[PDB]
Amino acid sequence: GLIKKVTHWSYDNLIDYLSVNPTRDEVTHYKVDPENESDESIIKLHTVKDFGSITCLDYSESEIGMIGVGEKNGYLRIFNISYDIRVRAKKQRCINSLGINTNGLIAMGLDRNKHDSSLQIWDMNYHDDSHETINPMFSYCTNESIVSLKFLNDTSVLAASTKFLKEIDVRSPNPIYQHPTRLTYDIKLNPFNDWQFSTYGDDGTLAIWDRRKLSDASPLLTFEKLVGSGAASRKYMNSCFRWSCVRNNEFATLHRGDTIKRWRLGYYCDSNIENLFVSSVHDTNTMYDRVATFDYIPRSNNGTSLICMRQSGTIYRMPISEVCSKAILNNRNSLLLSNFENTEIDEIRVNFWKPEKLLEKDISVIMRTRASLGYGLDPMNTVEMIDSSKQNNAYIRNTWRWIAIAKASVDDGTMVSGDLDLGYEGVIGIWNGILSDKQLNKEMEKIIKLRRKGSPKYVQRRLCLIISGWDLSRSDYEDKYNIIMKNGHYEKAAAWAVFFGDIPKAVEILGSAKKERLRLIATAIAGYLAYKDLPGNNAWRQQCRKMSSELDDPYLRVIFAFIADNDWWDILYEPAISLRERLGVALRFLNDTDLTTFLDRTSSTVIENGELEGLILTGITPNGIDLLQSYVNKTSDVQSAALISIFGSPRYFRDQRVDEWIQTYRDMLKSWELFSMRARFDVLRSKLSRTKTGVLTADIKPRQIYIQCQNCKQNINTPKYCCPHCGSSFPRCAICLMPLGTSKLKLNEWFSFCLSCNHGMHAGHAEEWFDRHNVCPTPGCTCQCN
Amino acid sequence: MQPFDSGHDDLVHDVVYDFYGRHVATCSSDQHIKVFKLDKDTSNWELSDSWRAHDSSIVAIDWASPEYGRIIASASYDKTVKLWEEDPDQEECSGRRWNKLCTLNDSKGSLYSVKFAPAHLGLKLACLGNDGILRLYDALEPSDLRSWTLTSEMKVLSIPPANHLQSDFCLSWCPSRFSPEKLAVSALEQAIIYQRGKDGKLHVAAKLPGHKSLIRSISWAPSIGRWYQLIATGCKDGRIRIFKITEKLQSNLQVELLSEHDDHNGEVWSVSWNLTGTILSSAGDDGKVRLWKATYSNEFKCMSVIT
Amino acid sequence: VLTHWIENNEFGEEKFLARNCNYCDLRVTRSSFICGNCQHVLHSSCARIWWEIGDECPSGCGCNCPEMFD
Ligand SMILES: [Zn+2]
Ligand SMILES: [Zn+2]
Ligand SMILES: [Zn+2]
Ligand SMILES: [Zn+2]
Ligand SMILES: [Zn+2]
Ligand SMILES: [Zn+2]
Ligand SMILES: [Zn+2]
């Protein structure tokens, strides 16, 4: 089987093909359309049959249709498809190779004859058609069997015998070189590099040769056992290696008749001669197995398709898949795709799941949008911004509400005074205690006795009520009820009334509401006041338990759970209600021996579960940093960890994880070009690293530059219009001729000193000058300062 | 999924984003580097500069951190590493916008991968080629960015690979500012994590097991603040191996495989992480790009598949 | 007046980070802004952007640069 691709014959975009069946009997001409993948593009035009057993084939590029056909008997049947002459050598033997040059020279590769020369070249315009034998214009290679030959140029020819590689010209009888090697079968020329060709041998050891390396003799490349055997045994070989016609330093080989490997080559010059080496190997499986030979198809936009002929002679068309070479991601969650075949690059912007929806739901772009909106800079502002957004961010709003409460407590002077700090602490730290016990107890009582205008741990429960924000008055409780009712959350108002115990007020609040369902719930709640003395296990409590099981609202769920049975333990473990309310109803109504167990259980749950609402229990402490670390492990949200841990870490405890989170968030803000947010984050870190004394514990950048005067070589200002150490005159502005002054920032107040030419102007003057100019305004400076 | 044509005359070998994400540089096999920028008005990629860089095909480029300026590395098959700095006062699309800085010729082999260091180690650099020798280049002088001095030289393979056998090399640095310096180095069927010891010389710290075939891409997941680090491996098999590296020779470190997916049925060419290490983009021989995320468990599950 | 960098004996990255703007963390070479109380650089564009919205030094040293740059 031989599929030979012929160009320069079709005026259209189609590519002509010449095919020989694997039994070596017929010659078929095709015209293949590259733009349609289906098999209808392979148009079978002509077929000439009964050509004995074909051993070689060639084509003439000068005139269209001249297709020489060889045979085993010796007849070199040269005819046209798009007359018919039958020539032969003077001695009848098998023709093993064939080449037709551009000018008209036609060579022929014969077997080994002692009294005849193998390589016989004649011209078509200078041959007599009345004789079967030929008139060899140039003859070489006596007593040798030439198995492969090809025309390099209009004069020279590269022929290979059974043992030598010969570069023989017609201008001189002396060949350029004769290299002794066995790999001398099927010389194929690279359509891009004219100095490179590839042969193979009987063992399949393919080798790429360089002509200039042999002329001077190692092969440029070798491939042990690459292609099929039978070179020295069978004269009918399937071409299982083809040079690439679409890009340089590439070729394709066929292995076991089913897979096709495209080997892409790399080249380096030791300094014209490039020492080749294999870079990448791409494997493509054919559509149908048992393929004998294949051929390339030059497609538009540097595409590749493979027309292949099977062992049965059936010809089909196998496209090459567009395999992605590189799929890089981005800080903005953008995917960039590069291909192994064409030039263009695919981009998936952010603007089985959909790609854009998955890139929009990732936490990277969520963190980017939150950082652009100003998340975490002010806790009350971020509670306001989260609450005025509907998605369903529940724990974030509650933990930022607690952070706002604790920051208001610290800013008011509460629980920062005394001999010990006790700032941003949690419920667990207050409850477990841990220099004298009486001294800390009396200063903690003094901490209680600051806003004064039957339990043993009353000097700790009150501190937990202060920390959690549950030390509010009953008139302010009525005001809070009015606020929650005005917000529209009637169920939360009812839940707070149930929490604070005034069940008739819960009935009054849920009654006369905007919904009929809330009125039905109010009637069910009111059916409890005249009912709480009942022993239980009755149909009303069963109905209330069923309603608690079935209902979707968590506030009414815990309302029904408290109404049906007067126990708080069904309320303290409900996760859908906020943990601040649960801690309020745990400090208000629970024995200390049970409150300690509840605190231990809830703290051990929230440390490992990564819940951000556990910061009420644990505070911003090392255990709070453990909580935030587990939250980062579960969620990959370093933004919230940074904005929470900056409140208490460098003020109180040096730990490496907070520094990692701060540096990561600063690099993320620089990555999204949010330099303003990074600067606000840095000044907020400096504000929140101040101790009670006032000493800044944050790490600041060291001092960078200072201004000299070159008359006393000192600083002109101490951390007037004259130098304060030598009295020399300061340089003036180049625009308004006003000097430098040394002793809410307006533009016309500081010099914008260039660090290259050392010439200073006022910033308003520099903006007005450098907007329409690009040179230093001083007389004799060439420095583009803007 | 709008495409843009890079304008190269040959294959495109490596495309990298910059730090800010608004610039891409595209190396190619026609010895050219084209830098593209994102216009905020037209919202389309446009060429900033195109220039002939090396004497062979360029296979890897990498941006430097912007605190060091606009520096683009370039490793190619002509055994050269060319470093390019952008001149601010130069015309657009002229070829003289990016000024050549150095040509590191210390490697006696055709290079495959160049990777700049993170922004906590210095202005370091890494190279690997078909010579088995790892080379590190530090720019120790902040006054001039041309005295690039070789500092570390570790041999990875015993012998250089054969002329005909194909082989791949890839690098990935550890971007953790609060951990000892580590380097993930892939050589054929071996993936080794180096570590900077107390003597200033790298040592073999941990080897990733598995890898029955060639390794086509190593990507270190960004250290967002977690207690574990992740390495994504694209092998010549179908396997996208994710390794959970826990660190606790300054510090010992353990390697545990987290996931191993055969969901491509071919060679995995490029695997790459996101900014936060949440989305893993794997491109394989099936023509489809598969995204991976972790939901409700440590094991990574599949997601949207882009073909 | 010539602007003189503080010759700080440094070893690693702070040698490179000495000559960097405190708003964008890029190298400053032309048209800088220098405070006197704190010795920190800014670009002219970075200073004209930051002082429209900020009040302290963007490096967070606690220096009120609109009132202490003299
Ligand atoms: Zn002076
Ligand atoms: Zn002026
Ligand atoms: Zn000047
Ligand atoms: Zn200047
Ligand atoms: Zn700046
Ligand atoms: Zn400052
Ligand atoms: Zn200042």
Side-chain angles (χ1 to χ4, degrees):
Chain A
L2 282 185
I3 321 291
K4 197 151 294 296
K5 200 181 89 71
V6 188
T7 64
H8 316 123
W9 280 5
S10 162
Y11 290 104
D12 214 0
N13 214 25
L14 316 178
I15 295 91
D16 292 11
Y17 281 80
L18 298 176
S19 298
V20 175
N21 53 6
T23 181
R24 302 276 175 159
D25 279 345
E26 82 192 4
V27 162
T28 302
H29 168 268
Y30 291 99
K31 290 179 72 68
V32 176
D33 183 44
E35 311 310 298
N36 211 27
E37 193 258 329
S38 173
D39 280 348
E40 61 86 20
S41 295
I42 320 182
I43 302 180
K44 181 151 142 179
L45 266 193
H46 288 291
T47 302
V48 286
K49 311 170 66 184
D50 296 332
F51 281 171
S53 51
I54 305 161
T55 47
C56 46
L57 192 146
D58 204 76
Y59 58 93
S60 192
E61 299 92 0
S62 64
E63 45 187 0
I64 296 94
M66 280 322 264
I67 302 147
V69 164
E71 276 170 353
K72 195 190 181 179
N73 51 76
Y75 270 127
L76 201 66
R77 176 136 180 189
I78 293 145
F79 57 92
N80 195 284
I81 285 182
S82 306
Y83 46 86
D84 208 334
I85 70 152
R86 316 182 182 89
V87 302
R88 66 181 168 90
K90 292 200 207 290
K91 315 274 203 297
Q92 184 174 1
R93 53 192 193 272
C94 170
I95 292 185
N96 301 271
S97 197
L98 175 59
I100 308 175
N101 216 348
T102 313
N103 53 356
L105 292 172
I106 299 182
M108 169 196 303
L110 294 173
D111 272 340
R112 171 166 99 171
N113 201 358
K114 214 164 188 177
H115 292 320
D116 205 77
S117 311
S118 307
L119 180 61
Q120 287 162 355
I121 314 167
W122 72 91
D123 195 11
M124 186 59 210
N125 297 321
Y126 301 130
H127 177 239
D128 202 7
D129 213 10
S130 46
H131 290 329
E132 272 190 348
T133 76
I134 51 172
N135 199 7
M137 290 175 56
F138 312 95
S139 284
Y140 303 94
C141 316
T142 80
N143 206 0
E144 277 166 353
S145 173
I146 291 288
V147 294
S148 192
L149 60 89
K150 199 68 78 163
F151 273 121
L152 309 173
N153 269 328
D154 288 350
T155 48
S156 72
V157 57
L158 182 74
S161 58
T162 177
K163 279 182 300 279
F164 283 85
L165 283 166
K166 306 191 172 67
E167 187 153 312
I168 319 177
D169 206 349
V170 298
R171 311 192 295 194
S172 175
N174 202 11
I176 306 183
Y177 49 88
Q178 280 176 0
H179 176 68
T181 181
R182 285 296 167 178
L183 321 173
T184 44
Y185 289 80
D186 218 353
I187 294 183
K188 318 210 182 54
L189 286 184
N190 181 26
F192 299 102
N193 203 3
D194 305 342
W195 312 94
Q196 271 173 4
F197 67 97
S198 303
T199 75
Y200 59 91
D202 185 44
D203 44 353
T205 310
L206 189 149
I208 305 188
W209 307 85
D210 202 324
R211 297 155 43 203
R212 301 176 272 173
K213 183 63 69 177
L214 302 156
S215 172
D216 204 21
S218 59
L220 215 51
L221 266 169
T222 187
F223 297 108
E224 198 179 8
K225 306 277 166 55
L226 193 74
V227 291
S229 179
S233 187
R234 331 284 179 179
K235 293 178 178 175
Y236 320 103
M237 296 200 81
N238 310 111
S239 61
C240 48
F241 155 75
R242 289 260 173 235
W243 270 90
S244 189
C245 75
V246 72
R247 46 188 46 94
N248 212 353
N249 297 292
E250 203 201 13
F251 57 90
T253 63
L254 171 69
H255 301 253
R256 291 154 309 188
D258 49 354
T259 178
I260 277 155
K261 308 205 201 285
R262 297 197 284 141
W263 306 56
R264 299 196 208 258
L265 310 165
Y267 65 99
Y268 60 98
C269 314
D270 292 331
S271 64
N272 285 4
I273 293 179
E274 312 163 11
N275 313 324
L276 291 185
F277 78 110
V278 173
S279 81
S280 47
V281 169
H282 294 60
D283 300 334
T284 310
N285 266 328
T286 59
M287 293 180 62
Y288 318 101
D289 293 0
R290 278 175 187 173
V291 191
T293 184
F294 68 99
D295 214 348
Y296 270 66
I297 291 179
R299 300 210 304 149
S300 65
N301 210 1
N302 308 316
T304 305
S305 291
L306 286 173
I307 182 166
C308 317
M309 158 185 255
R310 299 202 40 183
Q311 199 166 355
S312 75
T314 318
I315 288 186
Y316 67 96
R317 173 166 162 165
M318 193 262 287
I320 291 289
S321 178
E322 195 179 2
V323 180
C324 184
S325 66
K326 181 67 66 68
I328 44 170
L329 271 157
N330 206 27
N331 52 327
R332 281 95 184 268
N333 266 329
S334 285
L335 204 58
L336 202 57
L337 281 80
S338 305
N339 322 307
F340 279 121
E341 318 298 309
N342 43 42
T343 311
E344 69 267 14
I345 315 295
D346 294 343
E347 158 68 38
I348 313 174
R349 302 217 192 171
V350 71
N351 275 325
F352 283 159
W353 289 61
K354 296 178 180 182
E356 299 103 358
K357 297 307 187 181
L358 188 87
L359 296 168
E360 268 182 349
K361 286 297 284 186
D362 203 31
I363 200 159
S364 309
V365 69
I366 297 299
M367 273 189 271
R368 178 174 149 246
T369 50
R370 291 207 293 216
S372 307
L373 281 181
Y375 168 88
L377 309 182
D378 187 53
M380 210 53 203
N381 279 12
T382 188
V383 175
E384 182 178 1
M385 289 190 82
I386 283 156
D387 202 11
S388 312
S389 77
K390 261 175 180 180
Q391 283 89 11
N392 304 2
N393 311 320
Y395 62 92
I396 317 173
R397 200 201 162 274
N398 306 346
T399 193
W400 278 116
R401 184 79 193 87
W402 173 77
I403 286 171
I405 285 174
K407 185 206 168 290
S409 161
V410 162
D411 280 12
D412 275 357
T414 303
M415 222 186 301
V416 296
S417 43
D419 61 331
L420 59 85
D421 44 358
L422 204 62
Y424 293 105
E425 280 287 328
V427 177
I428 303 296
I430 297 292
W431 191 255
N432 210 6
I434 311 176
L435 312 177
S436 168
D437 200 15
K438 186 192 181 182
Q439 196 262 337
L440 68 94
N441 277 311
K442 67 183 59 175
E443 65 89 21
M444 214 173 292
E445 280 159 356
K446 190 253 290 179
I447 283 302
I448 287 300
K449 294 165 201 173
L450 191 59
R451 221 154 60 233
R452 287 278 95 86
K453 325 281 174 190
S455 55
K457 280 151 95 141
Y458 196 63
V459 304
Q460 284 184 5
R461 279 172 88 112
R462 283 300 290 263
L463 276 296
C464 297
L465 288 181
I466 287 284
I467 279 285
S468 195
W470 292 121
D471 205 0
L472 200 65
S473 67
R474 283 212 202 92
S475 46
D476 293 332
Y477 280 156
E478 303 187 355
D479 298 333
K480 280 227 159 188
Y481 286 153
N482 290 321
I483 282 169
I484 296 174
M485 283 154 69
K486 273 170 180 179
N487 292 351
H489 287 99
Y490 279 104
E491 301 99 341
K492 192 177 175 171
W496 273 37
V498 162
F499 281 167
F500 287 124
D502 49 357
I503 308 299
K505 199 164 182 180
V507 173
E508 189 199 6
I509 284 175
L510 264 189
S512 82
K514 294 180 176 181
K515 293 204 283 190
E516 196 174 4
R517 178 184 134 192
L518 295 186
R519 302 210 258 171
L520 289 165
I521 291 156
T523 315
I525 287 158
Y528 155 82
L529 316 173
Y531 191 82
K532 60 176 183 307
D533 302 336
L534 269 298
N537 280 313
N538 199 358
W540 191 87
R541 290 195 215 276
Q542 279 148 14
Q543 272 291 324
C544 285
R545 286 197 203 95
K546 284 292 180 182
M547 284 292 292
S548 81
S549 80
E550 68 94 19
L551 186 59
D552 52 340
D553 271 315
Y555 288 138
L556 312 163
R557 260 165 175 251
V558 308
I559 278 170
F560 279 153
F562 177 64
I563 287 304
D565 199 26
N566 278 302
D567 67 316
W568 301 105
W569 292 110
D570 302 315
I571 318 300
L572 295 172
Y573 293 130
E574 213 277 332
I577 64 185
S578 177
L579 186 45
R580 212 179 48 108
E581 298 172 2
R582 294 192 279 148
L583 264 181
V585 309
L587 296 153
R588 275 181 260 123
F589 304 106
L590 214 48
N591 299 318
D592 305 348
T593 62
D594 283 350
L595 179 60
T596 310
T597 62
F598 168 73
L599 277 183
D600 190 359
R601 182 149 180 177
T602 303
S603 175
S604 70
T605 308
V606 298
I607 286 304
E608 59 98 18
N609 268 355
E611 294 284 318
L612 270 191
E613 290 181 59
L615 292 172
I616 295 93
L617 281 85
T618 186
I620 312 186
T621 43
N623 311 321
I625 295 315
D626 289 352
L627 181 137
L628 288 150
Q629 171 75 82
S630 50
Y631 169 70
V632 162
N633 296 332
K634 190 183 71 92
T635 58
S636 296
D637 190 13
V638 73
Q639 173 174 57
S640 276
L643 274 297
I644 288 164
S645 309
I646 55 154
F647 274 99
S649 162
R651 202 172 159 171
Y652 298 128
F653 48 94
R654 289 291 300 162
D655 45 352
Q656 184 177 182
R657 308 178 268 200
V658 177
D659 299 331
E660 188 170 9
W661 298 334
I662 286 166
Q663 287 318 296
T664 314
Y665 191 46
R666 283 169 76 253
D667 293 8
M668 275 160 100
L669 285 165
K670 288 197 294 181
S671 187
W672 305 317
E673 285 175 26
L674 300 176
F675 300 118
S676 176
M677 302 294 162
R678 184 208 63 86
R680 291 186 199 180
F681 182 53
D682 275 326
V683 305
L684 185 63
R685 286 173 42 212
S686 295
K687 264 150 67 174
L688 296 170
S689 315
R690 300 290 178 89
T691 70
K692 180 76 181 172
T693 311
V695 192
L696 174 60
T697 60
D699 178 77
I700 64 169
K701 193 181 271 281
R703 293 181 184 271
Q704 303 178 286
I705 205 167
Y706 87 111
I707 279 174
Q708 292 189 343
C709 76
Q710 214 184 5
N711 277 128
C712 71
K713 292 175 182 179
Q714 296 279 313
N715 203 3
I716 75 162
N717 61 6
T718 303
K720 181 67 176 66
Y721 311 108
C722 278
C723 175
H725 297 335
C726 67
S728 184
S729 293
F730 280 163
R732 283 182 151 89
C733 178
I735 310 299
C736 63
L737 300 181
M738 292 286 288
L740 187 42
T742 52
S743 59
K744 297 185 59 181
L745 192 46
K746 304 183 182 180
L747 277 76
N748 279 316
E749 285 180 359
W750 46 271
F751 285 173
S752 163
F753 267 104
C754 177
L755 312 175
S756 298
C757 57
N758 299 344
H759 300 136
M761 318 157 71
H762 294 110
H765 301 165
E767 180 199 3
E768 203 177 2
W769 166 258
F770 279 118
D771 185 78
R772 44 186 311 175
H773 291 84
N774 281 320
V775 76
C776 183
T778 57
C781 191
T782 318
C783 172
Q784 319 191 359
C785 314
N786 194 2
Chain B
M1 284 181 59
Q2 47 180 356
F4 72 104
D5 199 13
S6 47
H8 285 307
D9 285 330
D10 214 346
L11 297 183
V12 186
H13 279 262
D14 208 305
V15 181
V16 288
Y17 267 107
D18 68 321
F19 189 70
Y20 304 143
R22 273 185 175 162
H23 276 88
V24 298
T26 65
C27 85
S28 63
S29 198
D30 64 336
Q31 63 203 359
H32 279 64
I33 297 175
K34 292 184 172 38
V35 175
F36 300 93
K37 69 166 157 180
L38 201 60
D39 198 9
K40 212 180 174 178
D41 286 330
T42 69
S43 311
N44 213 13
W45 291 98
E46 58 184 359
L47 190 145
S48 170
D49 196 34
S50 168
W51 70 98
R52 188 196 163 170
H54 292 243
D55 296 343
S56 285
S57 74
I58 306 166
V59 297
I61 54 182
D62 199 76
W63 286 79
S65 180
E67 47 194 57
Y68 294 99
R70 303 186 71 104
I71 307 183
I72 292 185
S74 48
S76 51
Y77 283 161
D78 60 344
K79 314 137 80 177
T80 58
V81 180
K82 286 174 185 203
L83 295 173
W84 304 79
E85 200 264 338
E86 163 169 347
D87 213 12
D89 48 356
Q90 200 60 253
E91 298 183 2
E92 294 275 327
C93 316
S94 66
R96 322 181 311 178
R97 183 76 182 269
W98 290 79
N99 277 114
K100 189 172 181 289
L101 290 190
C102 199
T103 309
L104 313 161
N105 305 312
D106 306 324
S107 172
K108 317 179 185 309
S110 293
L111 281 75
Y112 279 89
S113 51
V114 56
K115 275 299 171 205
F116 268 112
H120 81 279
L121 283 166
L123 194 50
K124 297 179 46 65
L125 188 140
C127 292
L128 198 54
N130 48 13
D131 213 14
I133 316 173
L134 181 63
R135 276 165 182 89
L136 298 200
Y137 298 90
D138 307 357
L140 302 169
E141 278 98 357
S143 59
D144 61 357
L145 308 168
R146 290 180 275 136
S147 61
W148 279 80
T149 62
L150 189 139
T151 51
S152 177
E153 206 173 346
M154 301 285 313
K155 216 181 200 307
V156 181
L157 304 161
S158 73
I159 46 166
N163 201 10
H164 45 95
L165 289 175
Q166 74 160 352
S167 64
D168 214 5
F169 302 95
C170 187
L171 296 146
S172 200
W173 283 90
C174 166
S176 51
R177 301 186 67 184
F178 298 94
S179 167
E181 159 202 331
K182 294 190 217 79
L183 185 51
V185 164
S186 69
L188 276 78
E189 62 261 9
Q190 303 276 344
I192 319 292
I193 300 172
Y194 291 125
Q195 202 173 336
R196 174 88 57 182
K198 295 190 178 78
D199 47 349
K201 294 186 181 178
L202 315 169
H203 308 319
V204 172
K207 319 164 65 169
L208 315 176
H211 314 307
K212 290 174 185 176
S213 296
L214 296 188
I215 302 309
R216 308 280 201 198
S217 50
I218 295 294
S219 190
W220 192 280
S223 177
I224 202 70
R226 304 183 277 255
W227 73 292
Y228 61 98
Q229 281 322 294
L230 298 176
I231 288 183
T233 306
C235 183
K236 206 207 176 191
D237 293 331
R239 274 87 191 263
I240 313 155
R241 273 178 206 83
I242 294 164
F243 294 95
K244 207 197 87 171
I245 297 90
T246 310
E247 194 190 15
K248 58 175 298 308
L249 282 72
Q250 201 174 356
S251 55
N252 45 356
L253 78 171
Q254 41 183 355
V255 167
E256 166 196 2
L257 185 70
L258 187 150
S259 77
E260 176 188 2
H261 311 125
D262 308 338
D263 269 337
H264 269 289
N265 306 2
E267 324 190 15
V268 187
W269 291 103
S270 74
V271 69
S272 77
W273 292 97
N274 213 23
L275 180 58
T276 63
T278 43
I279 292 185
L280 182 70
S281 78
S282 61
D285 213 11
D286 54 328
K288 301 176 188 289
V289 169
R290 296 195 196 270
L291 312 181
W292 304 80
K293 285 183 73 155
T295 48
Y296 212 64
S297 59
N298 209 11
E299 157 75 28
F300 279 27
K301 282 186 192 298
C302 192
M303 283 309 152
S304 159
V305 182
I306 301 106
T307 191
Chain C
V1 169
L2 60 93
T3 69
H4 188 216
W5 298 102
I6 297 286
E7 194 176 356
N8 269 338
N9 302 351
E10 307 308 309
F11 307 101
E13 284 185 354
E14 52 265 13
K15 251 184 159 177
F16 283 89
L17 292 166
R19 308 182 176 185
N20 277 325
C21 175
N22 289 278
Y23 190 79
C24 64
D25 284 330
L26 300 173
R27 188 180 176 183
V28 64
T29 179
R30 285 141 178 190
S31 194
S32 83
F33 158 68
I34 308 160
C35 180
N37 203 4
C38 75
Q39 292 166 13
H40 293 145
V41 292
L42 284 181
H43 286 112
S44 197
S45 297
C46 294
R48 84 171 282 189
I49 287 168
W50 175 235
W51 302 127
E52 284 186 351
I53 49 185
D55 281 327
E56 298 184 353
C57 188
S59 52
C61 57
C63 172
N64 313 294
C65 293
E67 292 186 354
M68 279 281 123
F69 70 101
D70 303 317

